[PDB]
Design a protein around this ligand. Structure first.
Ligand SMILES: [N+]
Ligand code: NA
Lengths: 197, 193
């Protein structure tokens, strides 16, 4: 089952991310930190328990993708990510929405010189990767009256959040990859040779 | 466990050989099958001169080296066996031997006139100066006789039975491992440390 560089890099990346650890990073996202208006936020806190609450669970990593530029000098790894968002309200003590979330992080890997060598270029959220799906709901009301408003803000906040949280890690994983694996992959890029087919 | 090509190649070969399966081939070597005293034993009815068993077949760490131009590759396949010598005539054992032998497979990348690149074996040979022999009522006499014949027969026998295998293994290697190695050899690029 030993294989070539392409299959070795993605296998090595995954193992690096998981010992990062990515899943913990994907469980401890500060979604509320960022996500009338404040009057309610104030009335509930001063209420002396309420508001809505959001739990992050079932974080997961899926099979990485790998694509190489036609010229052969650049590598683009895509990192499919998954989380579930449990939307509740402690006030009534009920769960209103259960969402499944999927998102991709597209990291570009470059070869660079500074006397370590295989480095992260652009880390970003792939456009169109964010798929929010309804898993469960208290009833027809939150689904017909809350979801779309909720997902709407989510399509605006999450991607840049995940990118910012995940993106540092992959760089830490690139530097720390097997020395000999890196060396070989660099050679192939420098000479614009295809190893991802 | 994920490494570069060199590291990956060695592990791939080791797993490939063992599941080949190399050990069985070494045990089943036809050492015996190979004048007056010889024909005499045949004519009598109820007698067998001597027998040899091969035991404790073992595969050691492969060695890898790359040519200076970076176009050819030389993998070293260290081998080990134990030879127990018996005389079935009497019911006795005789002596035990430890034999260590090295096989050297050269691995090349050649370009086809049709732009296709194939990875090719040619050639495999028992490595000169590899064969080593050690001792585990008297028996000092035959020892030099057994040592002498082993010294002029074994290496070619092992080469003959083993390197057909390695050739089988190289064919069955991972498609992308081969394509990656081949590209780097045919473009003269070092990946062996
Ligand atoms: N809504
Ligand atoms: Na629910």
């Amino acid at each position: 089952s030993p294989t070539g560089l392409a299959g070795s890099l993605t296998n090595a990346l995954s193992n690096g991310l998981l010992s990062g650890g990515l899943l913990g990073i994907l469980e401890n996202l500060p979604l509320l930190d960022i996500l009338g208006g404040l009057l309610g936020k104030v009335t509930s806190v001063i209420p002396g328990n309420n508001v809505i609450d959001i739990k992050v669970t079932d974080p997961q990593l899926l099979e990485l993708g790998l694509v190489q530029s036609p010229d052969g000098h650049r590598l683009y790894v895509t990192i499919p990510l998954g989380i579930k968002l449990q939307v509740n309200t402690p006030l009534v003590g009920a769960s209103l929405l259960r969402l499944a979330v999927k998102l991709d992080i597209t990291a570009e890997i470059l070869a660079v010189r500074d006397k370590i060598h295989l480095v992260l270029g652009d880390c970003t959220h792939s456009p169109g990767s964010l798929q929010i799906s309804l898993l469960d709901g208290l009833g027809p009301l939150p689904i017909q009256g809350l979801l779309d408003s909720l997902t709407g803000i989510l399509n605006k906040v999450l991607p840049e959040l995940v990118q910012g949280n995940v993106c540092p890690l992959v760089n830490e994983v690139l530097r720390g990859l097997d020395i000999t694996l890196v060396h070989d992959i660099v050679n192939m890029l420098i000479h614009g040779l295809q190893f991802v087919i």
